[PDB]
Design a protein around this ligand. Structure first.
Ligand SMILES: Cc1c(C(=O)/C=C(\O)C(=O)O)ccc2[nH]ccc12
Ligand SMILES: [Mg+2]
Length: 713
């Protein structure tokens, strides 16, 4: 009726045409054999994929039952650990080994810096993300609360000089700290020149060079009156733009216009938790954006070209003007009716994504005929982040999938590299084996701490009531999880070979707090960590200039700072831990968060957006935070902390508040049960305990499809 038959598969026409007319041409893959391959791969790997999913359920049932047959609330760690081993949850750790992944770009093996993650369905965000390799420090400081909006220094309709001066001073201090002068301060600079290949900085009473002249990387314009000077520190570039006749330069002692930081070294184009894609139409819109990015012709605004510099000696060179791109595929769980078989059964979306995003990525290995000749991966790798994997057999399966896809695409084996999200408990406690199962493909491990927290709650759902959502970030289990991740990577030889990454900062308006606190991540040895915007990427870059990540990692070598016991420490709430008002606040906090997110997901197909919590702090959250909130209330409901009336009342109380915050928006109040979005939120909480591993996708997908079908009437 609207589907194309290929072997046992019935492919939605919109997807079939997209692949044939847009994805395949230029790849030199015969369409016939591609589609035959899709059918073969799906048929061969579907059974294993299903067996893996059934194994999760069998494990979770056994754990649930272990908790229900015990009364002793002080959990016996010795017996729990033995139980997990018996049932195959906790596997033996393999002998020491080193990863052998090759053909990986410098941005991944060597450079430490921010990693930006954006929804691929939003073409403009995606474009801005790709262009976010360079970002204005002045704009990041002026536009955020990193420079406090104190009296006199508030941002108005026009340039506030008092504020600008604070921005300038902040950046002079950064420069002093990052690329020190031999004597004196950048704050007192009057000019820059290049003399015999050395950077010279004029002070009022003298001239001076850098304390480390090798931090001078280049310049533009005349050496004796440069338009910019390029510095490098800890592998990251810093560009001072010189323009006395500019609106800012005119007020600056050296005529400096801006300081540009190399910011988002790598970007993850997300098909998973930050997007809403429930059918072939949604997937195509995403695939098309991924295609445009890899061909370099995406336009919503266009992709930046490379940056040209003059070397200290006077020669010419270029730096990449774009972030190196990963794509995040969906995980092993969900099916999607973009393709169905002859029984009407939907095909696994993870299998589809590997095939399609892998196909499309081939274009990023060829020179863009357009805004190029930017090759995404010069070293010939395709970078796919695989989320939500549970344990080493699931990693093995992703390997096999990637291997079979490479064959269908005619790519060399191991072309398709894997960024492993460590964001499920069964991966956390078997991490070394997981890395080993991908020892030839792995290019990162990353602590997806939000999903990890969700999995923590669901796995131990039957053990007792959990601590509040805000308490979770500082629990012993999570701190051990974070340290264990770093330790496993380093011991597997990631240093110099693969990224060790940490998680997302979600408080987009609290940039001063981000600058003060997120430095903890590179201090702990992470070579990269996630940010949600180009602005946040520029500000997080500051941290990699303050912290020598390579040195931190080498200082950590051989350390064993987390035990299996610490990892298995369930975040159970203590006896009488909350007063009535604290319980109410937490319920209201979670309900508002769920409703605010779900209404845009279900009604407008938006997978990530800003939602003010119970303190008005605007959070840029995605499905993972929804997973936490819904599981936490499900856990409180399961154990009698709150009643179903408390939840209902809270949802009904927060709903008009969420309608206010969104004032093409259809209001949830007052006809709650006429709102598909309101009912979805309720369902996420009330059925949370019965969702597989607490995953929210089954409900969101069902409800979004219901909504779309209504709008079609
Ligand atoms: C991409 C993302 C995540 C995210 O997916 C993190 C992880 O996968 C995790 O912690 O599990 C969380 C919050 C966000 N806000 C804007 C983008 C965004
Ligand atoms: Mg996640």
């Amino acid at each position: 009726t609207d589907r194309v038959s290929v072997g046992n598969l019935r492919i939605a026409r919109v997807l079939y045409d997209f692949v044939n007319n847009e994805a395949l041409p230029g790849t030199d893959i015969d369409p016939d054999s591609f589609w035959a391959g899709v059918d073969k791969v799906v048929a061969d790997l579907t059974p294993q994929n299903q067996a893996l999913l059934n194994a999760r359920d069998e494990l979770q049932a056994q754990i649930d039952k272990w908790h229900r047959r015990r009364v002793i609330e002080p959990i016996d760690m010795d017996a729990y650990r033995q139980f997990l081993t018996e049932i195959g949850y906790l596997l033996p750790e393999p002998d020491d080994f080193t990863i052998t992944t090759s053909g990986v770009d410098a941005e991944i093996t060597t450079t430490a810096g921010p990693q930006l993650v954006v929804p691929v369905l939003n073409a403009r965000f995606a474009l801005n993300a790709a262009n976010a390799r360079w970002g204005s420090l002045y704009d990041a400081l002026y536009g955020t609360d990193v420079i406090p909006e104190t009296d006199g220094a508030e941002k108005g309709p026009t340039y506030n000089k008092v504020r600008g001066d604070k921005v300038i001073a902040y950046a002079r201090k950064f420069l002093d700290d990052s690329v020190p002068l031999s004597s004196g301060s950048f704050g007192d600079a009057t000019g820059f020149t290049v003399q015999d290949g050395q950077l010279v900085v004029a002070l009022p009473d003298k001239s001076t060079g850098l304390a480390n002249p090798g931090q001078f990387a280049g310049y533009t314009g005349a050496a004796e009156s440069p338009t910019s000077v390029l510095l490098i520190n800890h592998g990251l570039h810093i560009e001072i733009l010189i323009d006395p006749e500019s609106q800012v330069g005119t007020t600056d002692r050296a005529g400096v216009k801006d300081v540009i930081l190399e910011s988002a070294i790598t970007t993850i184009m997300d098909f998973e938790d930050s997007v809403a894609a429930v059918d072939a139409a949604d997937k195509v819109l995403g695939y098309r954006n991924w295609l445009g990015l890899n061909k370099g012709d995406l336009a919503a605004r266009v992709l930046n070209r490379d940056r040209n510099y003059t070397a200290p000696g006077g020669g010419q060179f270029t730096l990449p003007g774009r972030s190196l791109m990963f794509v995040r595929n969906v995980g092993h769980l969900m099916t999607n009716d973009a393709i169905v078989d002859t029984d009407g059964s939907e095909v696994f979306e993870g299998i589809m994504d590997a095939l399609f995003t892998g196909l499309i990525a081939i274009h990023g290995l060829k020179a863009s005929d357009v805004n190029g000749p930017l090759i995404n991966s010069r070293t010939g790798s395709i970078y796919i982040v695989k989320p939500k994997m549970h344990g080493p057999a699931e990693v093995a399966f992703t390997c096999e999938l990637f291997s079979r896809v490479e064959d269908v695409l005619g790519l060399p084996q191991n072309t398709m590299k894997i960024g492993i999200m460590d964001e499920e408990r069964r991966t956390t406690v078997n991490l070394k084996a997981c890395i080993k199962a991908a020892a030839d493909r792995v290019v990162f491990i990353n602590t997806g701490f939000l999903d990890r927290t969700g999995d923590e709650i669901h796995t131990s759902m039957e053990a007792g009531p959990m601590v509040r959502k805000g308490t979770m970030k500082s629990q012993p289990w999570i701190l051990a999880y974070e340290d264990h991740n770093v330790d496993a990577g380093l011991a597997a030889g990631f240093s110099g070979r693969a990224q060790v990454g940490k998680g997302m900062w979600t408080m987009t308006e609290l940039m001063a707090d981000m600058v003060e606190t997120k430095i903890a991540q590179p201090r702990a040895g992470a070579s990269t960590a996630w940010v949600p915007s180009p602005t946040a990427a520029t500000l997080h870059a500051l941290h990699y200039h303050q912290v020598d990540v390579a040195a931190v990692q080498q200082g950590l070598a051989g350390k064993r700072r987390a035990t299996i016991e610490q990892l298995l420490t369930i975040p159970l709430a203590k006896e009488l831990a909350w007063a009535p008002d604290e319980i109410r606040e937490e319920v209201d906090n979670n309900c508002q968060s769920i409703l605010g997110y779900v209404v845009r997901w279900v009604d407008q197909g938006v997978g990530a957006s800003k939602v003010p919590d119970i303190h008005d702090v605007a959070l840029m959250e995605d499905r993972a935070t929804l997973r936490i909130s819904s599981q936490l209330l499900a856990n409180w409901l399961r154990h009698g902390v709150i009643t179903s009336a408390d939840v209902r009342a809270s949802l009904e109380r927060m709903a008009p508040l969420v309608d206010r915050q969104n004032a093409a928006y259809r209001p949830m109040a007052p006809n709650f049960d006429d709102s598909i979005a309101f009912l979805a939120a309720q369902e996420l909480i009330l059925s949370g305990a019965q969702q597989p591993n607490g995953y929210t996708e089954p409900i969101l997908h069902r409800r979004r499809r219901e909504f779309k079908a209504r709008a079609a009437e």
